[PDB]
Amino acid sequence: FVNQHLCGSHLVEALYLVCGERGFFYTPKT
Amino acid sequence: GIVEQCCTSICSLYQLENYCN
Numbered sequence: 911f912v913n914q915h916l917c918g919s920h921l922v923e924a925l926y927l928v929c930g931e932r933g934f935f936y937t938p939k940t
Numbered sequence: 941g942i943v944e945q946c947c948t949s950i951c952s953l954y955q956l957e958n959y960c961n
């Protein structure tokens with residue numbers, strides 16, 4: 911798997927691909 | 941949360957799966 915900082919929409923597509931049919935939760939509120 | 945962990949620094953594939961449902 912890529913070894914990099916994953917930000918914005920790039921983070922979300924990473925999630926989408928990795929999680930598949932499970933789906934995911936994106937809560938950037940820091 | 942995810943930004944700090946995967947954006948701010950770097951995340952292994954395993955650290956990313958923690959955010960799946």
Ligand SMILES: [Zn+2]
Pocket residue numbers: 920
């Ligand atoms: Zn970009």
